[PDB]
């Protein structure tokens, strides 16, 4: 029937896949406005689709969003226990708004609707709804990694989370290892029955699990990359190594600066002839662990440039700013090397967008972290372990001097994979699998 | 007859710092024996290293790792330097560093002794050696001994906070002559001395304290201006010559100094950030290059300021940078003086804004290096000793970042006629108070004093 999409924020990107499914049918996109202060539920309609937003109180945002989502789940799911900041009033807050959002979404549902829930903010949502009587087919997709038991079981509230996740009919993950980790955690807590492959029972409750590796829109990226500057006419001499991501400790930005320093240290042949540009807009800047990383990068930029810089050559361009998506695609195109080395990442679309944006007759080289979800598919990238800075240095030198013949063959294999598994292929696979599920 | 010069830091016969440059030029006018530290550590016991290069004889010694620690890193650089630059919060006084300082002053006095002739005139340089005359008098040398302090002398409220302030004052009175950079320095000394004891002053400049007689005077250090013009007019190294024809659209703001907290580098960066924020017309059209070689890197205060400076470079470029334009170039590196002079010449603006500075040679070098037919603009802190002389500079208070930014904007848009006017007046002063003139006045005043006798 109608498709109901629930996510932390709505867009009146992840957008194209969600908007895509919800267009092939229509329905509702329900989510928080992204603003605060106190009100009746706001709606905007455009054909078969409606957008539904709502505000949050200051205290509710703090406990649920700033604290539990961003200071407990985010760090823990990225294998950063040292960074989790669990307090009880935050866990209560996270339950309270999940419940509240079940209330608000109640007068809008219809008995044959399908329901698609997105991401770590809404883990207890299936539970809140089923408590309020809903029996519709409910699917969940987790965009970030799912951690092994040894990490997950450290959450003081891990057993509740596991119980509630089982109130979904379908659980979708970015990779196979995420799927197994979730099943591993459950198995530690309770007995699980695998009737047949990817169909399960625990505490009597029934549910299915599957891997849906999220992708991009290859044709669209190609268009904006090829679009219509003086800097380019000036730099036919300098090869550009380029990185872009949110300023987040999962991304391993300081380890990246250290690998670049290592390149400059052990490969003097490149002095004056290469540049590294890192774009990193501020994200979640009111959490302490984020401010920590931000000051580190300021210091590291100042230090590396001060050491290796010359009167007419600045080795490192660090820009703490947001750039528009279309512009970035063009930058990908003229960049000789794409540096994507996160410490832990659900997928990382940046790595996919980089390959999609390349001129296929003269493509740049992708250097990719083994811990990004994308490493499972993009096997023709230069795969690296970011904890070995000298290996990342070695790979960067390898990428800078790679013959056009090898550049083309790696790039084509990777573009092949990205084409087959589009954003549209992603969203169709989820919705189809969700439909085959028999409701209770 | 013979001039004996003593300083900690020497210029090597064949490092950033104004003392060694000043003395080197001073001795090229004079001739003499230059006694001082080689710069190396270890083999403290090896004989004096004697090198002859024209009319200058060098004699150098090594220091032990431990002598370096106490005399240099602890007391000179962590007690005297911060205090004399009005940074009492940075002073790390403990009694063993003081004892260390006196011990090596005495050790050095023993080493000089056998090289002294009876009619030698002795010129001691700078804060490392305040107790030197006193060690010499104790070993019966009755020669003319002059002292020149290259840094400011702080007012009584600051100076008197030094636990050891009274001994320092007592020992300074063992010199026959004391020279200072500015009248304010000379007056501060006399003020401090007056609090401790009755000083009898005749004229303005002639004194007795504890029955010791001595003279004070102001000798603002200068440069060798024609020589700077020649080294500045030379061609750039082939690499940088090629680069120079790319900075034709961009105006250059240039600064150079040791990475020292006296130099106000963080505040200067904040002034530039203010230029960027309040004068957006300059975006993509200017560049500020800061050359800041590490100085005294084993002292905590110096490590702290370096970390502050690094953060600010990263932050300001992170905030105001663009894909094809980096506003600020920070270089934690030493550059050859001759290269620096050429860089001064092609810069449009010299930014010289220390919080406290004994004189600041860089500000004078900057004006001497300019092409008189197309000169850049000096922006100068009122707290540099040189601001007493370089009156036609753009004088600013680096505590007011907006006033520094306004001066930057004014310097960047200044007409050719105003630039020449300003440059000529400053260059006139610099030519009249030559390094030759400095040396000449000091030595001549010293030769006018009759030696004490037994
Ligand atoms: O809203 P933000 O700016 O604080 O963070 C941006 C998104 C980061 C996160 N992006 C994930 C999505 C994707 C796309 O499926 C993966 O490529 C990333 O590795 C993974 O980090 C998160 O899942 C979203 O809910 C966030 O809104
Ligand atoms: O020898 P360092 O490396 O510990 O420091 C360099 C010099 C900085 C200092 N130069 C001063 C000299 C001069 C000119 O002689 C003034 O221009 C400066 O304002 C003043 O800071 C210090 O006084 C000297 O003894 C030092 O050798
Ligand atoms: O300044 C920026 C930085 C990044 N992005 C986009 O943000 C998305 C980040 O997604 P990714 O999966 O790579 O990382 P995430 O932020 O979700 O962890 C990418 O599509 C980028 O194109 C952007 O539009 N402007
Ligand atoms: O990389 C550098 C930095 C500085 N200097 C020189 O070091 C001296 C600095 O003297 P100044 O009086 O400005 O300050 P100081 O360092 O003594 O406090 C000047 O002669 C500069 O030309 C240099 O030759 N190379």
Cβ-Cβ contacts under 8 Å for A175 (sequence gap 6 or more): A145, A211, A213, A373, A376
What is the C-alpha separation between A118 and A47, in angstroms, rounded? Answer: 23
Residue B329: list chain A partners with CB under 8 A: 305, 309, 311, 314
DSSP β-bridge partners for residue A338: A242, A366
Structure determined via:
X-ray
Q: Can you say how many angstroms the Cα of residue A242 is from the centroid of all Cα atoms in its chain?
A: 19
Q: Are residues A350 and A384 in the same domain?
A: yes
What is the C-alpha separation between B281 and A136, in angstroms, rounded? Answer: 60
Query: What is the C-alpha radius of gyration for chain B, rounded to an integer number of angstroms?
Result: 23
Ligand in nearest proximity to the CA of B19 = 2
Look at ligand 2, atom 2, and give the residue with the nearest C-alpha.
B17
Q: Are A317 and B326 in contact (CB under 8 A)?
A: yes
How many other β-carbons are positioned within 10 Å of the β-carbon of residue A177?
Answer: 16
E strands within A295-336?
316-319
A202 lines ligand 3 (CB under 6 A): no
- Residues just before a chain gap in chain B (C–N exceeding 2.5 Å) are 14
Strand B212-218 and strand B206-209: the pairing is: antiparallel
A295 at interface of B, judged by CB pairs closer than 8 A? yes
Q: Are residues B281 and B212 in the same domain?
A: no
Which of B310, B320, B335 to substitute to test the interface with A, most A CBs within 10 Å? Answer: B310
A214 lines ligand 1 (CB under 6 A): yes
- Tell me the residues of chain A between 199 and 258 that have a Cβ less than 8 Å away from chain B: 230-231, 234
Q: Are A44 and A66 in contact (CB under 8 A)?
A: no
CB spacing of A321 vs B319 below 8 angstroms: yes
Residue B215, H or E segment: strand B212-218
CB spacing of B324 vs A298 below 8 angstroms: no
Q: Are residues A356 and A260 in the same domain?
A: yes
Q: Are residues B177 and B219 in the same domain?
A: yes
- Residue of A60, A143, A388, A425 with catalytic role: A143
- Diameter over CA atoms, chain B: 75
Q: Which residue stretches of A46-175 are H helix?
A: 58-61, 74-77, 88-105, 125-131, 149-152, 158-165
* Angle at B333 (CA atoms; ends B327, B407), nearest 5 degrees: 40
Q: How far is the CA of A246 from the centre of ligand 3 (A)?
A: 7
For residue B311, the domain's CATH number is: 3.40.50.2000
Residue A305, H or E segment: helix A288-308
Q: Name the residue with tokens 């900057």.
A: B366
Report how far apart the first and last C-alpha atoms of chain B are (Å, whole number): 21
Q: Are B268 and B405 in contact (CB under 8 A)?
A: no
Resolution in A: 2.2
Q: Are A51 and A44 in contact (CB under 8 A)?
A: yes
Q: Are A223 and A353 in contact (CB under 8 A)?
A: no
Half-sphere exposure of A198 (CA within 13 A, CB side): 12
**Two tokens at B252?**
């250059």
Nearest residue to A7 via CA among A21, A16, A18: A18
3-state secondary structure of B333: coil
Domain count, chain B: 2
Q: Are B132 and B124 in contact (CB under 8 A)?
A: yes
Mutate to test the pocket of ligand 4, among B7, B17, B381 (most ligand atoms within 8 A of CB): B17
User: Quick one: residue A323, left, alpha or beta (phi over 0 = left, psi -120 to 50 = alpha)?
Assistant: beta
Q: Are A176 and A187 in contact (CB under 8 A)?
A: no
Q: Are residues B247 and B379 in the same domain?
A: yes
Nearest residue to A334 via CA among A253, A228, A192: A228
Q: Are residues A283 and A368 in the same domain?
A: yes
Residue B309: list chain A partners with CB under 8 A: 302
Ligand in nearest proximity to the CA of A11 = 1
Q: Name the residue with tokens 């004096």.
A: B48
Give how far Cα A252 sits from Cα of A243, A319, A386, Å. 12, 16, 8
Say if residue A435 carries a ligand binding annotation: no
Q: Are residues B335 and B234 in the same domain?
A: yes
Nearest residue to A77 via CA among A435, A343, A265, A354: A343
What is the C-alpha separation between A382 and A396, in angstroms, rounded? Answer: 9
A144 lines ligand 3 (CB under 6 A): no
Burial of residue A246 (number of CB atoms within 10 Å: 0-12, 13-18, 19+) = middle
B174 lines ligand 2 (CB under 6 A): no
3-state secondary structure of B265: helix
Residue B243: list chain A partners with CB under 8 A: 311-312
Q: How far is the CA of B370 from the centre of ligand 4 (A)?
A: 17
Q: Are residues B287 and B160 in the same domain?
A: no
Residue among B314, B319, B330 minimizing CB distance to A300: B314
3-state secondary structure of A364: coil
Taking the CA of residue A349 as reference, the ligand 1 atom at the shortest distance is 17
Q: How far is the CA of A343 from the centre of ligand 1 (A)?
A: 15
Which of A241, A243, A244, A302 to substitute to test the interface with B, most B CBs within 10 Å? Answer: A302
Q: Is A78 a catalytic residue?
A: no
Taking the CA of residue B357 as reference, the ligand 4 atom at the shortest distance is 18
Structural domain span for residue A258: 218-420
What is chain A's percent helix, strand, coil content, to nearest 5? 50, 20, 30
Q: What is the DSSP letter of A122?
A: G
What is the C-alpha separation between B239 and B449, in angstroms, rounded? Answer: 54
Q: Are residues A276 and A409 in the same domain?
A: yes
3-state secondary structure of A203: coil
Q: Are residues B175 and B274 in the same domain?
A: no
Q: How far is the CA of A247 from the centre of ligand 2 (A)?
A: 42
CB spacing of A312 vs B246 below 8 angstroms: yes
Strand A114-118 and strand A49-53: the pairing is: unpaired
Q: Are residues B207 and B326 in the same domain?
A: no
Strand A199-202 and strand A205-211: the pairing is: antiparallel
Q: Are B188 and B397 in contact (CB under 8 A)?
A: no
B1 at interface of A, judged by CB pairs closer than 8 A? no
Residue B40 dihedral angles phi and psi, to the nearest 5°: -80, 165
A188 at interface of B, judged by CB pairs closer than 8 A? no
Q: How far is the CA of A46 from the centre of ligand 2 (A)?
A: 73
Q: Are residues B276 and B420 in the same domain?
A: yes
**Two tokens at B244?**
């120079």
Counts for chain A of helices (H) and strands (E), in that order: 17, 16
What is the C-alpha separation between A275 and A271, in angstroms, rounded? Answer: 9
DSSP β-bridge partners for residue A367: A339, A382
Residue among A277, A298, A312 minimizing CB distance to B314: A298
């Amino acid at each position: 029937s109608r498709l109901v999409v629930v996510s932390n924020r709505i867009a009146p990107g992840l957008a194209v896949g969600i908007l895509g499914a919800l267009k092939a049918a229509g329905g509702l996109w329900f989510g928080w406005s992204g603003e605060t202060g106190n009100q009746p539920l706001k709606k905007v309609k455009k054909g078969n689709i409606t957008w539904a937003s709502f505000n949050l109180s200051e205290q509710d945002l703090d406990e649920y969003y700033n604290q539990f989502s961003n200071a407990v789940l985010w760090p823990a799911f990225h294998y950063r226990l040292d960074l989790v900041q669990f307090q009880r009033p935050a866990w209560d807050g996270y339950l309270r708004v999940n419940a509240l959002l079940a209330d608000k979404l109640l007068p809008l549902l219809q008995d044959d609707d399908i329901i698609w829930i997105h991401d770590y903010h809404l883990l207890p949502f299936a539970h809140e709804l089923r408590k309020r009587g809903v029996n519709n087919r409910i699917g969940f997709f987790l965009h970030i990694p799912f951690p092994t038991p040894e990490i997950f079981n450290a959450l003081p509230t891990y057993d509740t989370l596991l119980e509630q996740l089982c109130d979904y009919d379908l659980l979708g993950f970015q990779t196979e290892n995420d799927r197994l980790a979730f099943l591993d955690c459950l198995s530690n807590l309770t007995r699980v029955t695998t009737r047949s492959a990817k169909s399960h029972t625990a505490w009597g409750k029934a549910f299915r699990t599957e891997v849906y590796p999220i992708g991009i829109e290859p044709k669209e990226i190609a268009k904006q990359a090829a679009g219509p500057a003086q800097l380019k006419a000036e730099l036919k001499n300098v090869q550009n190594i380029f990185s872009v991501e949110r300023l987040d400790y999962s991304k391993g930005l300081p380890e990246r600066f250290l690998a670049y320093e290592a390149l400059l240290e052990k490969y003097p042949q490149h002095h004056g002839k290469i540049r590294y540009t890192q774009i990193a807009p501020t994200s979640r800047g009111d959490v302490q662990a984020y401010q920590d990383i931000r000051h580190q990068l300021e210091n590291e930029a100042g230090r590396i440039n001060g050491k290796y810089g010359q009167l007419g050559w600045t080795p490192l361009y660090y820009l703490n700013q947001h750039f528009d998506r279309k512009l970035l695609m063009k930058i990908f195109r003229y960049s000789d090397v794409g540096l994507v080395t996160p410490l832990r990442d659900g997928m990382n679309l940046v790595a996919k967008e980089y390959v999609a944006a390349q001129d296929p007759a003269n493509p740049g080289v992708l250097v990719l972290s083994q811990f990004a979800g994308a490493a499972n598919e993009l096997t023709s990238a230069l795969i690296v372990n970011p904890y070995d800075r000298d290996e990342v240095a070695a790979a960067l030198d390898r990428a800078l001097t790679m013959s056009l013949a090898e550049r083309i063959s790696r790039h084509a294999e990777m573009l092949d994979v990205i084409v087959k598994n589009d954003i549209n292929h992603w969203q169709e696979c989820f919705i189809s699998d969700l439909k085959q599920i028999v409701p209770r």
